[PDB]
């Protein structure tokens, strides 16, 4: 199927508590493979991604050097952002960025990403065209002007179409036995009375990978979007994910409700009912 590589970067100022902490976490799909942290001298490889162990000292020296450079740039960006927003030196602020690429089954670029946020709000993002920017406010229009003057979009595009796609193809080949494996959900339906005239039906999906899944309840073949309580997909801690969807139904009507489960690990969607 399709695959993605993403880095999630966070720089947080902590006045009176040293220089801003900077963290960069890399993912292939829903598998974290590396973590860089300014609080640490060396990167940390994830044990659930042993395929990254394959990389030599040239890879690590170059990535460590890039991370140190990025740490310097983001620390300087936080200082400049305080100024752009007329903020005092007293408060803690956060700068985040996410970037990476999506590739099709052929390994070709489907799309690139490069977005930034300041204090949890969109700041500036590279558009899908990989040439123009979306600036959220007047401060980000200042950055957009500096970046258009320095032709930054050309440099980010070069990374996204080049390095990003090439390295993702390499990680996928090295970790093919795991990264290309979808684990289907293990499913079951539970039933608990709420009152003498209503009961909750809960449809469970456990042990699946990747995280993308669709759980829907239907009543007489109609989606119950508004009446379904859907928890956020959660990590089990062993590479897999879990999710549930519940619906409150009139007692005696349980057989009119069917849970529909869609996941990459399944050849065709599952239809489940409560089995008393």
């Amino acid at each position: 199927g399709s695959h993605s590589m993403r880095y999630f970067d966070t720089a947080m100022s902590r006045p009176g508590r040293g220089e801003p902490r900077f963290i960069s976490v890399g993912y292939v799909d829903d598998t974290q493979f590396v973590r860089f942290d300014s609080d640490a001298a060396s990167p940390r490889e994830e044990p659930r991604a042993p395929w990254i162990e394959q990389e030599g000292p040239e890879y690590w020296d170059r990535n460590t050097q890039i991370f140190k450079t990025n740490t310097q740039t983001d620390r300087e960006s936080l200082r400049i952002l305080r100024g752009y927003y007329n903020q005092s030196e007293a408060g803690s602020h956060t700068l985040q960025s996410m970037y990476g690429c999506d590739v099709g089954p052929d390994g070709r670029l489907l799309r690139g990403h490069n977005q930034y946020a300041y204090d949890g709000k969109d700041y500036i993002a590279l558009n899908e065209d990989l040439r123009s920017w979306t600036a959220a406010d007047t401060a980000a229009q200042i950055t957009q002007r500096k970046w258009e003057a320095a032709r930054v979009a050309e440099q980010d595009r070069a990374y996204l179409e080049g390095t990003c796609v090439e390295w993702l193809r390499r990680y996928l080949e090295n970790g093919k036995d795991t990264l290309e494996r979808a684990d289907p959900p293990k499913t079951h339906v539970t039933h608990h009375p709420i009152s003498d005239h209503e009961a909750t039906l809960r449809c469970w999906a456990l042990g699946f990978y990747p995280a993308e899944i669709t759980l829907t309840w239907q009543r007489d073949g109609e989606d119950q979007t508004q009446d379904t309580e859907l928890v956020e997909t959660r990590p089990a801690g062993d590479r897999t994910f879990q999710k549930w969807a519940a619906v409150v139904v009139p007692s005696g009507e349980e057989q009119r409700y069917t849970c529909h489960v869609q996941h990459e690990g399944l050849p065709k969607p599952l239809t489940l009912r409560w089995e008393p």
Binding site: Y7, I66, F67, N70, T73, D74, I80, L81, T143, Y159
Partner: peptide, 9 residues
């Protein structure tokens, strides 16, 4: 593989 951020905000 990391991307180098040459220009700041």
């Amino acid at each position: 593989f990391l991307r180098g951020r040459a220009y700041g905000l």
